């Protein structure tokens, strides 16, 4: 008799982020990966190269210059607000 | 008789982040990975290279220059607020 | 008769971060990894290289220059607030 | 007759971070890893290299220069506040 | 008849961090790892290298220069506050 009651009665004015889950090489099975996922300026360079990517003779030069003027200005991230003044000014 | 009551009655104006879970090479099974995941400027360089990536003879130069003028300005991260003044100013 | 009551009645205006879980090479099974995960400037260089990545003869130079002018300015991280003035100023 | 009552009645305006869990090479099973996890400037260089990563003959130079002008300014981390003035100024 | 009542009635405006858990190579099982985990500038260099990582002949130079101008300024870490003025100024 599984019973999940979430947020039954809401008279007011809220700001909500609900997530209700009810259950009864690289291999992934039977999962929930990302629901509210925020990835900002994420980088992956060499992921899951194949079987024997450099088998016998390899002269590999891996230079990774992460070098830049960047400006991430997020006034409210994954954050609800009922009554508020959210501002980014310059 | 599993019964989960979350946030039954809310008269006011809240700011909520609910997450209700009810249950009855690299291999991952039967999981919930990231629900409210915030990844800022995350980096992965060599992940899960294949079987025998440099087997016999390898001359590998791995230079990883993480070098940049960066500005992450987050006024409210994963943080709700009911009545408030959230500001980023310059 | 499992019964979980969380936050039954809320008249006021709160700021909440709820998480209710009710249960009845690298291998991970049957888990909940990250729910409110905040990863800022996280780095992983060599993770889970394959079977025999440098088997017989390897001349590996691993230079990892973590060197940059960076500015992470987070006014409120994973921290809700009901009535407040949250500000980042310059 | 397992019964968990958390935060039954809240008239006021709080700022809460609830987490209610109710239960009845590198291998990890049957766990909850990170719920409110905050990782700032975390680094992992060589994790879980494969079976026999440098088996017979290896000339490995591992130089790890962690050297940079960095500024992490977090005004409130994993810390809710009901009525308050939280400020980062310059 | 397990019964856990936490924070039954709260009239005022608090700032709370609740965590209620109710239960009835490197291998880890059946655990709760980190709930409110704050890791700042944590580093792990060589963790869980595979079976026989340098078996027969190895000339390994491990130089780890942890050398940088860094500024971590956290005004309130894992510390809620009801009525307060929390400030980082420069």
Curated annotation (Swiss-Prot), chains A, B, C, D, E:
Keyword terms: Amyloid, Amyloidosis, Cytoplasm, Disease variant, Gamma-carboxyglutamic acid, Glycoprotein, Hormone, Neuropathy, Phosphoprotein, Secreted, Signal, Sulfation, Thyroid hormone, Transport
GO cellular component, one term: azurophil granule lumen
Localization of this protein: Secreted; Cytoplasm
Further comment found in the protein's record: Tetramer dissociation and partial unfolding leads to the formation of aggregates and amyloid fibrils. Small molecules that occupy at least one of the thyroid hormone binding sites stabilize the tetramer, and thereby stabilize the native state and protect against misfolding and the formation of amyloid fibrils.
Post-translational events: Not glycosylated under normal conditions. Following unfolding, caused for example by variant AMYLD1 'Gly-38', the cryptic Asn-65 site is exposed and glycosylated by STT3B-containing OST complex, leading to its degradation by the ER-associated degradation (ERAD) pathway.
Functional description taken from the UniProt entry: Thyroid hormone-binding protein. Probably transports thyroxine from the bloodstream to the brain.
Gene: TTR
Main location: secreted
Effect of residue 83 to S: In AMYLD1; amyloid polyneuropathy
Result of altering residue 56 to Q: In AMYLD1; amyloid polyneuropathy and cardiomyopathy
Family to which the UniProt record says this protein belongs: Belongs to the transthyretin family.
Subunit comment: Homotetramer. Dimer of dimers. In the homotetramer, subunits assemble around a central channel that can accommodate two ligand molecules. Interacts with RBP4.
Binding sites annotated in the UniProt record for L-thyroxine: 5, 84
Tissues expressing this chain: Detected in serum and cerebrospinal fluid (at protein level). Highly expressed in choroid plexus epithelial cells. Detected in retina pigment epithelium and liver.
Effect ascribed to mutating residue 23 to L: In AMYLD1; amyloid polyneuropathy
Keyword Phosphoprotein included in the entry's annotation: yes
Effect of residue 20 to A: In AMYLD1; amyloid polyneuropathy
Effect of residue 58 to S: In AMYLD1; amyloid polyneuropathy
GO molecular function: hormone activity; hormone binding; identical protein binding; molecular sequestering activity; protein-containing complex binding
Name of the protein this chain belongs to: Transthyretin
Organism encoding this protein: Homo sapiens
Residues of the whole record sequence present: 31 to 143 of 147
Effect of residue 37 to N: In AMYLD1; amyloid polyneuropathy
Effect after changing residue 25 to R: In AMYLD1; amyloid polyneuropathy
Effect of residue 10 to I: In AMYLD1; late-onset amyloid polyneuropathy with carpal tunnel syndrome
Outcome of mutating residue 61 to A: In a patient with amyloidosis
Residues glycosylated per entry: 65
């Amino acid at each position: 008799p599984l019973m999940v009651k979430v947020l039954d009665a809401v008279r007011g004015s809220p700001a909500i982020n609900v997530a209700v889950h009810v259950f009864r090489l690289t291999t992934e099975e039977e999962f929930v990966e990302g629901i509210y996922k925020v990835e900002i300026d994420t980088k992956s360079y060499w992921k899951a190269l194949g079987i024997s990517p450099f088998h016998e003779h390899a002269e590999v030069v891996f230079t990774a210059n992460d070098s830049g003027p960047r400006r991430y200005t997020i006034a409210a991230l994954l954050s609800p607000y009922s009554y508020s003044t959210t501002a980014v000014v310059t």
